[PDB]
């Protein structure tokens, strides 16, 4: 009412678990466009002589204060809730394959924040370190690929053209094939 609205948030990610068509930043307008619309209500008596310092604004100070209090930490979620399983697939891959579809500034900040990890990782000097692919013992470097209906088509890795779904298969070397595991790919090598 005054922000009980995330009960509505709950459905946006429903298909979007491991069969994601696409995401929406949506539904956010009046849950946003009221919030400091109603600051004007919050400021109506903010340091006002309307009652000259008595009880009568403390019970609604709580309205003034709770109103924020819920807005923030839900609005933590709107990225944090969105940072979580995106970090997870962004663990499943680095920025080898970002999202199939100021969050980019926070992602770039998170990518710069992850640098610390990368510095010690692999060596003192640092390696974006393989954590999520090639438990392969490495074999000969130039043999092709197979998938299980991947989608997004971000394979930018050193190949002729792969067309990243099942039968994304061309003469693709090891440098190419270093992308993904469990987003519709690894029935096969």
């Amino acid at each position: 009412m005054f922000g009980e609205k995330a009960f509505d948030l709950l459905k946006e990610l429903e298909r979007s678990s491991q069969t994601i068509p696409a995401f929406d930043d949506d539904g956010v307008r009046q849950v946003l466009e009221e919030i400091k619309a109603i600051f004007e209500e919050n400021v109506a008596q903010a340091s006002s002589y309307n009652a000259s310092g008595d009880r009568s604004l403390w019970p609604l100070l709580n309205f003034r204060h709770a109103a924020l209090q819920r807005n923030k930490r839900c609005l933590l979620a709107y990225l944090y809730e969105r940072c979580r399983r995106i970090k997870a697939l962004r663990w499943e891959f680095g920025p080898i394959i970002p999202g199939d579809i100021p969050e980019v500034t926070f992602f770039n900040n998170y990518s710069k924040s992850l640098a610390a990890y990368m510095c010690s990782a692999g060596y003192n000097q640092g390696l974006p370190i393989d954590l999520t692919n090639n438990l392969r013992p490495p074999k000969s470097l130039y043999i092709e690929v197979r998938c299980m209906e991947d989608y997004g088509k971000f394979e930018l890795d050193d190949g002729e053209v792969i067309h990243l779904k099942k039968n994304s298969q061309h003469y693709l070397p090891r440098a190419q094939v270093e992308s993904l595991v469990r987003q519709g790919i690894l029935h096969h090598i």
């Binding site: 009980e4 009960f7 819920r70 930490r73």
Partner: peptide
């Protein structure tokens, strides 16, 4: 600012 819940104003 609490031991949170998704429903923090159904608190």
């Amino acid at each position: 600012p609490n031991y949170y819940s998704i429903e923090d104003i159904f608190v």
